[PDB]
Amino acid sequence: VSLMEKLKWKIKCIENKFLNYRLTTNETVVAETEYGKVKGVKRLTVYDDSYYSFEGIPYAQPPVGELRFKAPQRPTPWDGVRDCCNHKDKSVQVDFITGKVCGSEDCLYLSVYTNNLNPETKRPVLVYIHGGGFIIGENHRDMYGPDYFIKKDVVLINIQYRLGALGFLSLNSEDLNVPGNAGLKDQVMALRWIKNNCANFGGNPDNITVFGESAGAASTHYMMLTEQTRGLFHRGILMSGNAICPWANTQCQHRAFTLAKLAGYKGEDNDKDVLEFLMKAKPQDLIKLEEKVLTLEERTNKVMFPFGPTVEPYQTADCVLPKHPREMVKTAWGNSIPTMMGNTSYEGLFFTSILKQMPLLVKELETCVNFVPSELADAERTAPETLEMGAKIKKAHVTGETPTADNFMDLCSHFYFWFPMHRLLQLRFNHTSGTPVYLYRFDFDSEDLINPYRIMRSGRGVKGVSHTDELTYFFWNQLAKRMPKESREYKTIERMTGIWTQFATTGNPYSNEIEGMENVSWDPIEKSDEVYKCLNISDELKMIDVPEMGKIKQWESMFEKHRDLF
Numbered sequence: 001v002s003l004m005e006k007l008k009w010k011i012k013c014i015e016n017k018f019l020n021y022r023l024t025t026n027e028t029v030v031a032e033t034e035y036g037k038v039k040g041v042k043r044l045t046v047y048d049d050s051y052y053s054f055e056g057i058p059y060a061q062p063p064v065g066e067l068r069f070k071a072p073q074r075p076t077p078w079d080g081v082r083d084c085c086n087h088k089d090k091s092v093q094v095d096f097i098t099g100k101v102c103g104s105e106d107c108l109y110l111s112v113y114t115n116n117l118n119p120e121t122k123r124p125v126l127v128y129i130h131g132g133g134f135i136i137g138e139n140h141r142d143m144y145g146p147d148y149f150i151k152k153d154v155v156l157i158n159i160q161y162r163l164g165a166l167g168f169l170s171l172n173s174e175d176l177n178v179p180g181n182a183g184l185k186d187q188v189m190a191l192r193w194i195k196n197n198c199a200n201f202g203g204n205p206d207n208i209t210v211f212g213e214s215a216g217a218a219s220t221h222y223m224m225l226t227e228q229t230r231g232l233f234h235r236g237i238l239m240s241g242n243a244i245c246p247w248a249n250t251q252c253q254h255r256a257f258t259l260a261k262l263a264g265y266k267g268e269d270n271d272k273d274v275l276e277f278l279m280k281a282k283p284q285d286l287i288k289l290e291e292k293v294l295t296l297e298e299r300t301n302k303v304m305f306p307f308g309p310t311v312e313p314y315q316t317a318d319c320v321l322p323k324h325p326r327e328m329v330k331t332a333w334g335n336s337i338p339t340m341m342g343n344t345s346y347e348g349l350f351f352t353s354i355l356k357q358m359p360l361l362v363k364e365l366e367t368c369v370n371f372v373p374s375e376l377a378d379a380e381r382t383a384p385e386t387l388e389m390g391a392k393i394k395k396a397h398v399t400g401e402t403p404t405a406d407n408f409m410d411l412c413s414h415f416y417f418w419f420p421m422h423r424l425l426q427l428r429f430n431h432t433s434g435t436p437v438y439l440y441r442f443d444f445d446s447e448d449l450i451n452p453y454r455i456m457r458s459g460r461g462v463k464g465v466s467h468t469d470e471l472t473y474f475f476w477n478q479l480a481k482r483m484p485k486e487s488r489e490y491k492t493i494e495r496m497t498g499i500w501t502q503f504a505t506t507g508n509p510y511s512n513e514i515e516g517m518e519n520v521s522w523d524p525i526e527k528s529d530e531v532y533k534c535l536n537i538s539d540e541l542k543m544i545d546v547p548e549m550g551k552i553k554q555w556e557s558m559f560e561k562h563r564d565l566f
Helices: 003-022 164-168 182-201 215-225 255-262 271-278 283-288 296-300 347-357 359-366 384-397 405-429 488-506 549-559
Strands: 024-031 037-044 050-058 081-083 109-114 123-129 155-159 203-213 235-239 339-344 437-442 533-537 541-545
Touching (some): 050 182, 109 182, 182 203, 203 488, 215 235, 339 405, 347 405, 359 384, 359 405, 384 549
Parallel strands (some): 123 155, 123 203, 235 339, 437 533
Antiparallel strands (some): 037 050, 050 109
């Protein structure tokens, strides 16, 4: 990231701190939790609303020392009153702005928000799991501010969880108790905390909604797939992702060794000796070198991250993913709760920045063999069947004689987002009680209000609605500003938070009390549907057939001779 966005972000960081002090009140309050009493503070928003803020609530023991890479344990209760008037640190991660490593291993907290600590009726509880490829993200309010949501009468909860190698190291050897998915196991225990404690904040423990975007969407889906969370919540929202996205899981058991070797390990490739080195390495050293772990073959085969959610090698007490996600959908308790899914109208536009560094990537679309689903493609991507499959992809996105960056970014939309959504919907249909799934398409383009991901994707002055453009209309961030109430952006905030709270409440996203929705007939998706219908969200709200459907079926035809793998 540029030296200009570095000084610019440095300034907004200083501004966000003064604004946050300014927006604090003297009104402290205490709430009960099963671990003891917590002290929150009332805060202000730039729209002159206010909310109770409880930050730095521990939901697990700090995963330090011998607990590093291990499943989380319950925290230690306390007498007295724990101070929750400040945020704790984020998980150790590489700062996308500076490139420096920041964060702390002591990161396993959640934040609770609401405009009314003593509502006259129990409220819907909405749990947000942030994205960031399982390697970045946080629940800090400079990024995920609760300011738009607390205009509504809900309780909003933002959780953190271990990221990167510290979140997702995985070793085969059953003696060392590092099966994998530590970071997901963090999310589970946070759900168990929210279940047993939301009531103390005016929340309804019987009406809980978990949602998230990108890696947070994959997370949300995982919480809907695993047995560990059965019955914990009642609605799910999958925003631009799910667990069968190709980036949402990986077999990384061999990569521990490589990481150790990058960090200076001397010795042989066995898990024990590998683990012992990793256990005493400085945390920021491990995180900083994660970028180097993937081999060039793996990057070629479109492996996006070295460490992430994985099929655990053996089953233990807190196991989360005992089988590949496709297999888990077949028995998942979550198939039988109300579900909303969606994507933006130009997902792959996010990859503008990557192409800017590697224009050689656009040539991958000459045969598209690298984007063939890996389970179908051969190692070298050279088999004639693989060239055939690649040809089908090529027909779907290469508009001319030579591929462009746009063809590329359009393909990515499908490879990373729409095709997995399709595969999940069809698998789910053959294994579900018949609970509705609703689709949305986010199509609202604006440069007048942005969020920090636009700095990373280099989305400055770029038209089209990219992956993460929607977050702007859900959460406040330190790049936001007060918007005129008649503006298209303000309306979109109102609609977006309106639809989500409505879905959270009823398991049905439609409300006539939401502006623009008066002609809307939002029907869910049925197994018999050949064509998906979705609520397309732009300056107006309109039910349409998903525009991406033709390309979606093109991809599915790659599985013509391998229907068992679809």
